[PDB]
Nucleic acid binder design. Sequence first.
RNA 1: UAAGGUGAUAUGAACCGUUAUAACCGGCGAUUUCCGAAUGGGGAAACCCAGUGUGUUUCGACACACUAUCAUUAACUGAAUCCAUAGGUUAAUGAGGCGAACCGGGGGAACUGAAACAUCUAAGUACCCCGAGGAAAAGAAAUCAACCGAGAUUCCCCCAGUAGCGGCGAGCGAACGGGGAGCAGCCCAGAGCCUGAAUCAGUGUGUGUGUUAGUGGAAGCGUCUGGAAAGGCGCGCGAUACAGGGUGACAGCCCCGUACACAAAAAUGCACAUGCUGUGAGCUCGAUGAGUAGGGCGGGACACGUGGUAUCCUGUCUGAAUAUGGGGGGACCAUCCUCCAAGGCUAAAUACUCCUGACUGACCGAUAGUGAACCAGUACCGUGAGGGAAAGGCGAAAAGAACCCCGGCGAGGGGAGUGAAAAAGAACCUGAAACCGUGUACGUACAAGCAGUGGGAGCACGCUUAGGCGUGUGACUGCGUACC
Lengths: 102, 46, 50, 63
Amino acid sequence: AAKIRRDDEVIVLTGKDKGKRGKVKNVLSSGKVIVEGINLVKKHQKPVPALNQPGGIVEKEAAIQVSNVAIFNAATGKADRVGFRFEDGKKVRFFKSNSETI
Amino acid sequence: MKRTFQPSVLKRNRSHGFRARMATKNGRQVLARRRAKGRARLTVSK
Amino acid sequence: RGALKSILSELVRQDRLIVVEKFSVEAPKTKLLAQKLKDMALEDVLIITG
Amino acid sequence: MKAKELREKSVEELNTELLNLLREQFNLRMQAASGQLQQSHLLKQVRRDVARVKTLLNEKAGA
RNA sequence: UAAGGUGAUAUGAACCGUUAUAACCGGCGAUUUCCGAAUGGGGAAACCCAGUGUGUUUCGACACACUAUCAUUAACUGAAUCCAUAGGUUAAUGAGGCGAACCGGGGGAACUGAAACAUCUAAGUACCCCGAGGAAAAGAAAUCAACCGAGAUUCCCCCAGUAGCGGCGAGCGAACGGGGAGCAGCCCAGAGCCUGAAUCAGUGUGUGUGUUAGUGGAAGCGUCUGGAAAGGCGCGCGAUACAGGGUGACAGCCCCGUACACAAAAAUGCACAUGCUGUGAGCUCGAUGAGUAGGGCGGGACACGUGGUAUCCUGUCUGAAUAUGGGGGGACCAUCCUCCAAGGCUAAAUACUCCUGACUGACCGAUAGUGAACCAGUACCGUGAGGGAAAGGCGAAAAGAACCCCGGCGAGGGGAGUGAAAAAGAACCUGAAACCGUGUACGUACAAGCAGUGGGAGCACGCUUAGGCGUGUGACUGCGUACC
């Protein structure tokens, strides 16, 4: 329902990863919006005994919710709320408050 | 003397019976205050 | 009736600020009235007129 | 075909399709005999179409 | 609309789908594993079998269709009885099933403030029973008065706590008089002339505009300190937006609220404009349903609790007269007044917030608040009939022991570490209390008397250019009985 259409670039700024940049995300009902997986060092699980135990320590689910920077382009992360006009008949895709639509 | 607690079905018809807890008005207020208003369940119908 | 109203002779120097009636306000930009509330001097302190 | 794509049809599945569409549940749906890398649980993900007739026939018989 | 989704709280895995039915919101409609509230009859709640039909079958049978008690009107039918009546076989249709509570019917206590209890208060409340709608009970004057008068009813301050009754006891407790709120009249008992003319129960249509989607919706940067600066300053801009709290904090600055502009399928609010089925309008002339009342004695609620007696009641019984009056004038009757013929109908004022919707909080901030934060009327007692808990709460990201090392292929720690933190580590609360273990030094295995504060030796330790102090069990013994 978000009117900003999932192909798009964002960063973290509402947390210590301040600056870390990426696009499209992973999006489902109640998703924590993980940018492009911008995680550091965080374990994976070893239940299986056989030859394949998950050797991983990064890119697992690391959160910063909804969107704090309204799709990046150059700098600046507002206005988010703004809802535009006709583009698709049955829906509307959006950009931000000085650039009409994508 | 022969104390006391035990389970049985056939002894429910004058005392413990769900249709009689609705047949009697005396039971009927209990039945609603215990589940329909009382947020709950009984389910022990067997 | 009830000398309740008599405070303006207790203070008399900073307070009842006898000036002009209310018409002067914008109002859709009420943010502006700080500039015009200078005849009473008061800027923002307690925004009445009675 | 989610039922809605075939609505043009002169008769409904109780004409004998009702059984051709349901045999699988008692003849193939056991341990791995309907599949092991490709199928699993069929009846709602895809095959939910068959339940939909059971209102529609009541719907149509009155129209 | 805008894209993702499979109601979940092991998510393993299928499989829809970002073209405009993948889910999911919403109008209306459709869904039957058997009970069913349930209803052919049976009931020990989850029925176990009667009846008679139907489309059709590999002709086994089948999934399915329908019935009852009543209140009320048609049709057929029918007794001990020419007749009467009663009772069945159908035809139609709706209610019987279910609410916390209001409200109409009456009941309805025991003891207990009275210092005694067989008046009363208690108490018209516990409940139990019966009605039928969201509003009711009411209400169209045998009403209240002094001759002035008032108008269904009474309401609201009064007058008044006045009149007014009593084991002369504790309680109960009016009306008139004044100001007001109010501020309008019909229909049968029935014929005529008139005749879709006035209303409303329904049932379709258009607007005037609801219900909610869809439409929306505001400001800024640098720097010293910095896990998040969303603090501080700067004002570089801001205001009918500075609720409240979320985002890891304290964010005018991002918000989500407001303030404001645009707009729906299709039933359908209510106001009207209408339309189809049904109602009654206009104006004369006719019209008048007493077992009703009376008493004499009972039971009575009435301002009047037994008493002389007061109605409008009520019950065994008895028993008139049509307004050429008497039923009654809160003792009884004058003088004389007012209702009115005993059939039915009325705008306003009152209460129930089921639950969910708008705004205030010298109100509840888990010793509580609707039993209610829960998912707690749930489990720890119940022959049970069911009384209902001990109980608020990790916290960026489940970021929920990567990894190493020992041991019982264990428990727990010693470092790493996501981390501000493990003094947030899944016997999830950022956190003393009843009681405890190893220890720095005491007093010390001849003990007395709330175990003392004194008066002081020097001792585990500490400061001092040396300066008698900053530290506690407590050698000597003095003082005593700390309570309430």
